[PDB]
Design an enzyme around this catalytic site. Structure first.
Site, PDB file in Angstrom:
ATOM      1  N   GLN A  19       0.807  -1.215   0.000  1.00  0.00           N
ATOM      2  CA  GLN A  19       0.000   0.000   0.000  1.00  0.00           C
ATOM      3  C   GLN A  19       0.846   1.275   0.000  1.00  0.00           C
ATOM      4  OE1 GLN A  19      -1.645  -1.218   4.003  1.00  0.00           O
ATOM      5  NE2 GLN A  19      -1.601   0.999   4.363  1.00  0.00           N
ATOM      6  N   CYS A  25      -5.168   0.462   3.763  1.00  0.00           N
ATOM      7  CA  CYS A  25      -5.249  -0.972   4.003  1.00  0.00           C
ATOM      8  C   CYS A  25      -6.691  -1.471   3.919  1.00  0.00           C
ATOM      9  CB  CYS A  25      -4.626  -1.356   5.343  1.00  0.00           C
ATOM     10  SG  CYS A  25      -4.942  -0.249   6.717  1.00  0.00           S
ATOM     11  N   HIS A 162      -5.811  -1.056  11.664  1.00  0.00           N
ATOM     12  CA  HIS A 162      -5.273  -1.620  10.433  1.00  0.00           C
ATOM     13  C   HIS A 162      -6.173  -2.726   9.903  1.00  0.00           C
ATOM     14  CE1 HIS A 162      -2.254  -2.354   7.421  1.00  0.00           C
ATOM     15  NE2 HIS A 162      -2.021  -3.587   7.835  1.00  0.00           N
ATOM     16  N   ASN A 182      -1.182  -9.388   4.766  1.00  0.00           N
ATOM     17  CA  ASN A 182      -1.031  -7.953   4.974  1.00  0.00           C
ATOM     18  C   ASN A 182      -0.808  -7.275   3.619  1.00  0.00           C
ATOM     19  OD1 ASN A 182      -0.819  -5.505   6.325  1.00  0.00           O
ATOM     20  ND2 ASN A 182       1.031  -6.051   7.481  1.00  0.00           N
TER      21      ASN A 182
END
Length: 215
Positions: A19, A25, A162, A182
């Protein structure tokens, strides 16, 4: 539900993305869940466009944050989301440039996992596919994670800062975990992944804000 599930092994999961500095995110999480459902529904795996969400979900705040639920509803009301190819990621919010000719998936809304319920989350991951989740990823230990089942005594279940993607769950040496994709690139964590403690009192708030798209 099975004792272990890993949708990476089933071709439901695209490569790890980065990102950059943008707090997007939520967009990567949303896209990842849509990608899993697209593969399940149509049989094809395609990279979808987080930039489309960053730029066009006016309900959210672009690089300043946002909710996956608002992202899914946007895709639904818009009657589509672009492929990454058709709407490339540039890591800064820009004017909405959604292009229907590049449409790669659709969304019929979303469902939410009951707050704090890891058992419901496990059942949803088994039944549905990858599930969008929010966690406390603010700690030093998370930043420098390398291997093993992640557990930090200080993780804050009310500090959901997150968004990531639960692509499976399992157990390593007796330690139950969630398999988490992630969006900080492949140089972070374990080639971009982290195993996070499962059934440890909802560690890091993993089941506090989980959702997935209908398709």
């Amino acid at each position: 539900a099975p004792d272990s599930v890993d949708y990476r092994k089933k071709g439901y999961v695209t490569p790890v993305k980065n990102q950059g500095q943008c707090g997007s995110c939520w967009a990567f999480s949303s896209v990842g869940a849509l990608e899993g459902q697209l593969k399940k529904k149509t049989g094809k795996l395609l990279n979808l466009s987080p930039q489309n969400l960053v730029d066009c979900v006016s309900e959210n705040d672009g690089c300043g944050g946002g909710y996956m639920t608002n992202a899914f509803q946007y895709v639904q009301k818009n009657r589509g989301i672009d492929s990454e190819d058709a709407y490339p990621y540039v890591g800064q919010e820009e004017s909405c440039m959604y292009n229907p000719t590049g449409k790669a998936a659709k969304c019929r809304g979303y469902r939410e996992i009951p707050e704090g319920n890891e058992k419901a989350l496990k059942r949803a991951v088994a039944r549905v596919g990858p599930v969008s989740v929010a966690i406390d990823a603010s700690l030093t230990s998370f930043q420098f994670y390398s291997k093993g089942v992640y557990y930090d005594e200080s993780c804050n279940s009310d500090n959901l800062n997150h968004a990531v993607l639960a692509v499976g769950y399992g157990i390593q040496k007796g330690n139950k975990h969630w398999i988490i994709k992630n969006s900080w690139g492949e140089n972070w964590g374990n080639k971009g992944y982290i195993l996070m403690a499962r059934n440890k009192n909802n560690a890091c708030g993993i089941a506090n804000l989980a959702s997935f798209p209908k398709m």
